[PDB]
Each structure stands twice: as structure tokens, then as C-alpha cells.
Amino acid sequence: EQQDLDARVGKEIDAARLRRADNAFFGEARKAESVTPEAALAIAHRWRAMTKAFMFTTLSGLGVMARRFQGQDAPDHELLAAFQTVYQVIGDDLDNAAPAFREVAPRGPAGIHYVWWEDTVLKPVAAHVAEEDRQSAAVLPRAVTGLLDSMDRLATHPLGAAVQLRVVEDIALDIAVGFRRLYAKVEVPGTTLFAGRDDLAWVDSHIKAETMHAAQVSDEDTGMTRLVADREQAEEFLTAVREYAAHWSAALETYAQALRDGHA
Amino acid sequence: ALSAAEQQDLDARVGKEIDAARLRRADNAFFGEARKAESVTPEAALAIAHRWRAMTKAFMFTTLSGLGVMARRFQGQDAPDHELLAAFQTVYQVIGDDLDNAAPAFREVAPRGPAGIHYVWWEDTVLKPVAAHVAEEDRQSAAVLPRAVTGLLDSMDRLATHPLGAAVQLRVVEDIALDIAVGFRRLYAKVEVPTLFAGRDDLAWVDSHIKAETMHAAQVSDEDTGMTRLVADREQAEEFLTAVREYAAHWSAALETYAQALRDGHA
Numbered sequence: 437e438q439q440d441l442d443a444r445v446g447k448e449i450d451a452a453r454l455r456r457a458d459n460a461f462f463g464e465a466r467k468a469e470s471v472t473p474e475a476a477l478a479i480a481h482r483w484r485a486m487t488k489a490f491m492f493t494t495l496s497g498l499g500v501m502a503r504r505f506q507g508q509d510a511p512d513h514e515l516l517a518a519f520q521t522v523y524q525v526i527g528d529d530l531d532n533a534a535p536a537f538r539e540v541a542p543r544g545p546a547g548i549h550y551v552w553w554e555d556t557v558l559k560p561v562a563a564h565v566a567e568e569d570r571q572s573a574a575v576l577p578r579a580v581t582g583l584l585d586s587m588d589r590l591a592t593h594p595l596g597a598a599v600q601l602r603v604v605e606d607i608a609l610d611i612a613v614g615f616r617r618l619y620a621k622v623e624v625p626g627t628t629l630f631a632g633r634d635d636l637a638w639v640d641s642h643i644k645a646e647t648m649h650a651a652q653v654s655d656e657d658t659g660m661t662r663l664v665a666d667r668e669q670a671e672e673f674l675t676a677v678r679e680y681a682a683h684w685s686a687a688l689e690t691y692a693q694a695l696r697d698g699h700a
Numbered sequence: 701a702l703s704a705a706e707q708q709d710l711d712a713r714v715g716k717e718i719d720a721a722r723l724r725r726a727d728n729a730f731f732g733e734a735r736k737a738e739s740v741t742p743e744a745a746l747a748i749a750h751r752w753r754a755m756t757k758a759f760m761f762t763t764l765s766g767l768g769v770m771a772r773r774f775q776g777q778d779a780p781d782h783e784l785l786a787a788f789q790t791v792y793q794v795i796g797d798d799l800d801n802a803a804p805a806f807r808e809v810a811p812r813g814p815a816g817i818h819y820v821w822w823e824d825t826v827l828k829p830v831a832a833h834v835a836e837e838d839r840q841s842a843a844v845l846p847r848a849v850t851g852l853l854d855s856m857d858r859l860a861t862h863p864l865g866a867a868v869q870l871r872v873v874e875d876i877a878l879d880i881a882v883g884f885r886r887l888y889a890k891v892e893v894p895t896l897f898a899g900r901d902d903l904a905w906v907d908s909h910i911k912a913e914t915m916h917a918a919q920v921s922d923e924d925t926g927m928t929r930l931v932a933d934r935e936q937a938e939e940f941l942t943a944v945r946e947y948a949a950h951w952s953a954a955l956e957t958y959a960q961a962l963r964d965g966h967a
């Protein structure tokens with residue numbers, strides 16, 4: 437049953453068209469010749485919101501889990517093992533404790549991943565976009581805010597933090613690769629963006645690290661589904677993964693639209 | 701909105717509340733009774749171990765819960781101030797040491813996995829060794845928490861859903877944690893049994909905490925990234941001090957039962 441719940445979680449991510457071969461954003465990042473700065477800035481504002489919300493809502497869900505263990509006289513060590521994994525994995529976005537992030541990430545609040553992203557990706561591209569097109573890039577499509585509303589719900593769900601890590605850290609690497617590809621084809625005149633040695637340290641360090649995160653969230657012993665105590669919780673976990681993965685897919689497909697449209 | 705001259709007054713008053721609650725080394729009775737005691741009975745040592753396991757278990761989880769309420773408050777904001785984000789990171793690193801043992805002092809000694817969680821590490825290496833020397837009747841009696849301790853556990857449960865709860869708990873506990881650790885090292889070296897904790901690393905939980913709780917105390921009271929830096933306006937400054945005063949009062953009453961157990965020799 438433990439093994440089956442894993443496999444069925446993976447199938448829900450398949451059906452949501454999140455895998456590397458099925459998602460439009462992964463394709464359009466690979467196939468596009470150039471990327472207008474307006475489009476790249478629109479994706480930067482959307483990712484900034486989605487990854488900020490991801491970090492805080494997951495930490496929130498981690499606290500909801502904490503509040504349940506305190507209601508238990510002696511929580512089972514296997515549930516504590518997965519609890520530790522949530523803390524470690526989410527923490528890297530907050531404190532850069534992994535090897536790939538401790539190297540290059542800024543110190544203090546500027547190393548928080550959404551702050552790091554807006555400082556080294558969003559703003560450098562924003563310098564090449566007219567203010568009128570910057571306000572338009574800031575407007576978040578309702579598929580993005582729809583995902584933000586889902587994260588809000590999972591922020592108070594007893595299994596929410598596990599639903600978010602299991603799904604997100606399973607699509608992280610292909611997102612980081614799409615950014616590596618797309619933010620290098622941004623066509624601005626005279627200057628060439630992101631040509632310097634560590635101009636995209638955010639993206640590169642996430643490529644080196646998110647391989648370790650996918651293993652931890654899916655590890656059969658300290659993985660996220662080991663937070664599922666009984667069968668009724670396995671039903672809920674699957675149901676959350678289904679709706680959550682559906683929101684991520686529709687959110688990422690707006691990135692492909694921005695690339696196709698060349699604007700927000 | 702808090703001016704610079706206002707931030708400094710909040711830090712001073714927080715220190716004075718903890719002083720007023722008789723929690724400093726010279727004032728609290730537990731710290732003094734642990735030093736004065738010639739010998740400690742296994743019964744009293746086991747009651748303190750049971751109360752500490754409960755108090756440190758609740759502390760860690762409720763503080764983690766409080767870390768969650770803050771995360772929800774930050775998500776509601778479009779751009780949380782980096783000064784608040786800096787103290788947030790501190791909350792995350794200090795309380796995380798009870799869970800992942802990232803600090804240098806726990807780096808070498810702590811067990812790996814769930815058994816390294818400090819309340820689990822505490823009961824495995826301190827509680828269970830002393831429990832073997834206590835009659836059945838007295839183990840059930842040591843596991844029954846006094847009113848003052850359950851009063852502290854309730855105060856933790858209310859702060860678990862308070863938007864400043866984790867900052868309140870960390871500000872007080874990490875400030876007094878070193879003295880509690882020194883009290884544990886003294887009394888658990890004096891348990892009289894027909895000897896206990898004679899191996900070089902039998903009290904590694906305590907010794908690693910004597911080193912690490914020196915840092916934590918400094919981190920929570922830092923002027924730029926400390927706990928009062930999570931207080932945004934004058935109303936939250938009011939709630940912080942009222943919370944600190946009530947919380948410190950409960951901690952004082954709870955440690956008083958530790959001193960009482962050392963004097964009585966039983967639970």
C-alpha cells in the first residue's frame with residue numbers, strides 16, 4: 437500500500453501533463469528561437485509569486501503538521517523522519533543549507549529564493565522593458581492566482597506541505613532547465629543579457645540541487661507519502677495531488693502562452 | 701510604526717520582564733537547588749526528566765506551529781520587509797537545531813534520524829537510564845505532570861496559533877536554556893544509586909546544549925536579526941510584552957516544580 441500510493445501519485449502527475457514530454461512550457465522553452473523581454477519579464481513576475489507562495493504556504497503546512505504531532509503523546513519515528521525531510525527540503529529556499537546553494541547564494545534575506553530570483557533575474561530583464569509593458573507583465577493570469585489559491589488551501593491542510601513538496605520537487609528540474617534556456621534567448625538590442633560568468637546562479641544552482649530534492653521527496657522511507665497514516669488519508673492525499681497538479685499545469689501553460697505571444 | 705529609539709526600548713523591557721519573572725541564574729530556585737544539592741534521588745531526577753521531555757516536546761512543536769502562522773502572515777503581504785525576513789530566518793535556524801542538529805555543537809554528537817530530535821534524544825539517553833532505577837509506583841508518579849507544568853503546556857498551545865508566538869517562545873526559552881542545561885549537568889551527575897552517567901559521553905545531550913545554547917541566546921536577542929525585530933508596530937510591541945510576561949511567568953512556575961522535586965526527593 438505504501439508502494440502503491442507512491443506509484444499512483446506519480447500517475448496523477450503523468451495525467452496532469454506535467455512531465456517533461458507533455459507540458460507545453462517545457463516544449464516552448466526548448467523550441468523558441470528568441471524571447472522578447474516583455475515575455476521573459478512576465479514569466480519572472482509569475483514565478484516570483486508562485487515560488488514565494490510555495491515557500492510560505494509549505495512552511496505553513498509544516499506548522500499545521502507540527503500542531504498535530506503535539507496532540508500525540510509519542511509520534512511514530514517514521515512520521516518524524518518524513519517531518520525532518522520536509523524541514524530540510526523547504527529550508528534550502530529559506531537558508532540555502534544545501535551544497536549547491538551555500539556556494540553562491542547571497543547571505544541574509546537576499547538569499548531567500550524568491551528575493552534572489554527578483555534581484556538577479558526579474559530586475560535585470562525589467563531594465564530593458566518600458567514601464568507600460570512592465571505594469572502589464574506584473575498582472576498575474578487567473579491560472580496563476582488560481583494556483584496561489586490552491587496553495588492557500590494547502591497552507592492549512594494537515595497533509596498540504598507533503599502534497600506541495602511531492603509535486604513541485606518532482607517538476608523542479610525541468611522548470612529550472614526551461615529558465616536556463618529561455619532566459620538566455622532574451623533578445624535585447626546592443627547589449628546581450630546574462631552573458632557574465634555567474635549571471636544566472638539562481639538557475640544553475642537549482643539545476644545542480646533539485647536532483648537531490650526529487651530523491652528525498654520520493655524516497656520510500658523519508659519521502660512525502662510516509663506522512664500518510666491511514667487509508668482515508670491516502671484518499672485525501674491523492675485528491676489533493678490531483679487538484680494541485682492540475683493548477684500547476686494550467687499555471688505553467690500560461691508561461692508557454694507568454695512565449696508564443698511575445699507578451700503578457 | 702517603530703522608530704529606532706523605540707526598537708531599543710522594547711529590547712530592554714523584554715530583558716527586564718525575564719528578570720522580573722525570577723529566571724536569571726542568581727534568582728531562580730531550580731538553578732540554585734541543582735548546585736546546592738549534595739545528592740539527588742532517582743525519583744526526583746526521573747520526574748524532572750519526564751517534565752523536561754514534555755516541556756521540550758511541546759516547545760519545539762508549538763514553536764514550529766508558530767513559525768507556520770508567521771509564514772501565512774508573510775504570504776498575505778506583497779513584499780515582506782527584509783528586516784522581518786531576517787528575523788524569520790533566525791526563527792527557522794534556531795528551532796531547527798532541535799529537529800536536524802545543524803549547529804556545530806550538535807554536529808558531531810547527535811544521533812542521526814528521528815532519534816536525534818532533542819526530546820527523543822533526551823528520553824533515550826537521560827530519561828530511560830534513570831527510569832531503570834525507579835520502582836514502578838514512582839515511574840507512574842514521575843510521568844504525571846504538575847499543574848504548573850501543564851499550565852506551561854497550555855500557554856504553549858495558545859502561542860502556537862499566535863502571529864508572534866514563535867518569537868515569544870524563542871525569546872524566553874533560548875535566553876534561559878543555558879542555565880537549565882547547566883542545572884541538568886549538575887543534578888544528573890549527583891543521582892545516588894546503590895553510579896549513573898560515568899561514561900565520557902553519557903550526558904552528551906546536556907554538554908552539546910551547554911555549548912549550543914550560548915549561541916541561540918545571542919541569536920534571539922540580536923539587535924538586527926533577533927526576535928523583537930518581528931514586532932512591526934506599536935500594537936504588536938504591546939502584545940509581545942504581554943505575551944512575554946505571561947509566558948515567562950509560566951516558565952518560572954514550571955521550573956519551581958523542578959526545585960521542589962530536588963528538595964523533596966520525589967515527584
Ligand SMILES: CC[C@H](C)[C@H](N)C(=O)O
Pocket residue numbers: 486487490529549550604605607608611642
Ligand atoms: C517552487 C520551488 C522551486 C522548484 C525552487 N525550490 C525555487 O527556489 O523556486
Ligand SMILES: [Fe+2]
Pocket residue numbers: 528529549642
Ligand atoms: Fe529553491
Ligand SMILES: [Fe+2]
Pocket residue numbers: 525605608646649
Ligand atoms: Fe527544491
Ligand SMILES: [Fe+2]
Pocket residue numbers: 797798818909
Ligand atoms: Fe535543543
Ligand SMILES: [Fe+2]
Pocket residue numbers: 794797874877912913916
Ligand atoms: Fe536552543
Ligand SMILES: [Zn+2]
Pocket residue numbers: 582586679683
Ligand atoms: Zn481550484
Ligand SMILES: [Zn+2]
Pocket residue numbers: 697699
Ligand atoms: Zn499578441
Ligand SMILES: [Zn+2]
Pocket residue numbers: 855946950
Ligand atoms: Zn496563564
Ligand SMILES: [Zn+2]
Pocket residue numbers: 964966
Ligand atoms: Zn516527602
